[PDB]
């Protein structure tokens, strides 16, 4: 079977930025997507950040907050990704660029277990945008492979896309997303590669 | 001769007394639906995102008293003077929400009298702030220039996006975010836009 990794919030846990910050980088995707305006993602963290330090009157924090997106921490049980390559083809699926993406996963000590790494950048629209899940299907001439993510809007914009979802549920929601139920539902990655290891 | 296409909800209509994680998941869905190339009608988003929103905090038996109250909303104060501006500007609504669902509201608050016409963004299955939304009302009327008033920052944007002009009506003393275009007119209620308008004219 063929995983697509989300990163932001599936491998990375965004708990440690300030959440208007991350709130308002996710909207600005969505918005600017819809306006077909795109600008890379980089600038646009760039741009929230100065904005909701602005509002917060914290313009002085701007390095240091900037520096704990640089540095966030993968969820405890993302080591599993180890196990999970060996018995599925493993990749990333990220609104982030490449290069991004791939310093993130190094320094959390991940980046060698996946065979590849595809960023929405690519096709210039932002998730749940159908482009971003059909150009990886395209990319690796598959068809049945899973998005596999924390985030909801990600696992809807996958199924949309004609794409199949494991919902890695970290917050522990008992209410199905709206758009309809994923696929799969886990709570982690120890349990993803227990249901794979049952599916295979 | 001056243009102005009213926002709505938030805008025209006061959407404080409804939940507002509610309100915040139905402008979401708005745009996720967008984004996939996917539509609801605006009714049944409201229905599906309240719906989540109640089961989530163990309150779905609230169902249709929370609905009555979205069925319910009250104007701003302010909203009395599109009396006035009507008279000296050519008054639209341009509204994520139903042709239907508007003009009842309107009705309702007593409003719907002072409209030239009301327009959805229904009628080209995407939401606000594509720009096809604001282009259908330009392309409808036959008007070049025209002004979005709107209370909501991304509608604004939105709309100079699509090249139109807008008015932010600046209800809590906020700023426009920073991902697009500035407002042409900024103003903190309609007393203020009256004013504009009788200045402008």
Redesign the interface.
């Known amino acids: 079977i063929i995983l697509a990794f989300d990163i932001f919030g599936t491998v990375l846990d965004t708990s440690t930025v300030i959440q208007e910050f991350r709130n308002?980088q996710l909207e600005?995707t969505?918005?600017?997507?819809?306006?077909?305006?795109y600008?890379e993602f980089e600038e646009i963290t760039k741009?929230t950040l100065?904005?909701i330090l602005?509002?917060r009157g914290e313009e002085s924090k701007f390095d240091e907050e900037l520096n704990k997106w640089k540095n966030l921490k993968a969820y405890e049980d993302t080591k599993y990704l180890k196990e999970i390559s060996e018995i599925a083809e493993v990749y990333a699926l990220s609104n982030g660029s490449i290069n991004e993406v791939k310093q993130h996963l190094e320094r959390n000590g991940l980046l060698r277990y996946f065979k590849g790494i595809f960023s929405a950048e690519s096709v210039k629209?932002?998730?749940?945008?159908?482009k971003v899940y059909k150009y990886f299907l395209d990319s690796i001439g598959a068809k049945e492979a899973f998005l596999v993510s924390s985030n909801a809007?990600d696992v809807?914009?996958a199924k949309?896309?004609g794409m199949r979802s494991i919902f890695v549920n970290r917050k522990n929601?008992i209410?199905d997303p709206?758009?309809g139920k994923p696929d799969v539902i886990v709570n982690d990655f120890k349990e993803l590669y227990e249901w794979i290891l049952r599916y295979k």
């Open positions: 308002k600005y969505w918005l600017l997507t819809i306006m077909g305006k600008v741009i100065r904005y602005k509002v629209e932002y998730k749940p945008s159908p809007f809807i914009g949309n896309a929601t209410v709206i758009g």
